[PDB]
Amino acid sequence: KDGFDLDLTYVTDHVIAMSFPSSNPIGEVSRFFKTKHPDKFRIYNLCSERGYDETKFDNHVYRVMIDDHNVPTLVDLLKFIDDAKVWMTSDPDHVIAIHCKGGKGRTGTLVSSWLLEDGKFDTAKEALEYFGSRRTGDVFQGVETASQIRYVGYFEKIKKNYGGQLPPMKKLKVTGVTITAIQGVGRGNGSDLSMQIVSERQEVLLCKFAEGYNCALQYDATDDCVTCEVKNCPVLAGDIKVRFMSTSKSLPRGYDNCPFYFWFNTSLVEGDHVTLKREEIDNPHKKKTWKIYRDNFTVKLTFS
Numbered sequence: 001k002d003g004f005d006l007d008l009t010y011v012t013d014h015v016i017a018m019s020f021p022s023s024n025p026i027g028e029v030s031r032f033f034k035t036k037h038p039d040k041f042r043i044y045n046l047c048s049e050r051g052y053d054e055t056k057f058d059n060h061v062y063r064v065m066i067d068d069h070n071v072p073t074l075v076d077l078l079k080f081i082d083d084a085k086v087w088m089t090s091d092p093d094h095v096i097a098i099h100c101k102g103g104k105g106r107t108g109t110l111v112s113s114w115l116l117e118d119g120k121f122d123t124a125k126e127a128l129e130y131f132g133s134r135r136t137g138d139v140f141q142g143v144e145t146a147s148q149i150r151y152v153g154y155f156e157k158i159k160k161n162y163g164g165q166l167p168p169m170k171k172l173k174v175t176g177v178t179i180t181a182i183q184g185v186g187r188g189n190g191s192d193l194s195m196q197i198v199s200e201r202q203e204v205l206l207c208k209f210a211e212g213y214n215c216a217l218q219y220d221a222t223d224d225c226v227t228c229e230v231k232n233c234p235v236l237a238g239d240i241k242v243r244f245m246s247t248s249k250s251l252p253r254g255y256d257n258c259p260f261y262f263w264f265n266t267s268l269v270e271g272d273h274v275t276l277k278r279e280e281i282d283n284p285h286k287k288k289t290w291k292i293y294r295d296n297f298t299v300k301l302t303f304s
Contacts, residue, residue, distance in 0.1 A: 004032050011134045016097040017107050030056040042087045046100040066106045069255035071151040073239050074265050081117050105144030113155040124152040145282045147263035170267045173233040176302035180225045181294045186248035189219040190226030198241040239265050254283030275300040
């Protein structure tokens with residue numbers, strides 16, 4: 001129309017979400033920002049997996065390293081918010097454009113936190129539905145995973161309860177895991193399952209439930225659940241991902257190459273446990289899986 005053919009959306013007049021500038025061919029995305037926002041744009045590339053020629057955008061590209069179907073570190077989220085705040089407030093015509101690839105999970109985690117920082121919404125849930133409504137009211141139109149939703153909620157908590165800065169440090173050891181509604185999940189008794197805890201991109205603990213490898217499994221058929229005592233957990237600090245793997249052929253992988261997983265940050269855990277409902281766990285949150293993960297499916301981690 002103005003001669004551009006692009007997956008690009010104005011979420012607001014000064015906040016753009018878009019797809020990856022590939023070589024949207026990069027020469028056209030580049031021409032677009034140089035034509036409609038000359039000297040007044042800043043681009044954010046959220047892809048851990050891929051960069052590009054940032055000189056097509058006059059070197060005004062800020063990188064946040066986020067894995068697809070995952071979350072930024074909370075530190076990186078807050079740094080992004082500071083960088084965008086300085087850019088956005090130094091000139092009424094400055095704009096920010098946010099992207100990775102799918103225009104959706106990673107992009108919506110940062111756009112929705114930005115919309116909270118700018119005061120347009122009071123709650124993560126409204127900012128999330130609002131971004132969902134600009135791409136396509138459902139929070140799962142805003143981002144892809146339950147951890148993405150959690151991290152926008154972490155930003156809201158930081159803003160509201162911790163003065164816009166990180167909370168006092170809390171460190172944890174996982175000593176137990178409990179999974180309810182286990183029938184129908186893999187072998188229905190925990191025996192196909194293992195659990196990996198990942199910190200700073202590395203495995204810090206692996207548990208294999210049938211074998212008692214760093215753990216001991218109890219299956220309670222009456223209560224339709226499994227408990228496992230977790231052994232040898234190192235002290236955990238910061239953003240932690242917990243992944244559950246299965247030897248079972250009937251238990252499919254969703255995102256992240258595993259049946260189900262989640263992120264949490266140790267300083268934002270309340271008390272001695274975290275319990276997540278089905279819609280709060282990555283992969284069981286998708287309705288295509290709700291004959292495997294029933295409505296009372298939950299994962300609880302116990303801490304010391």
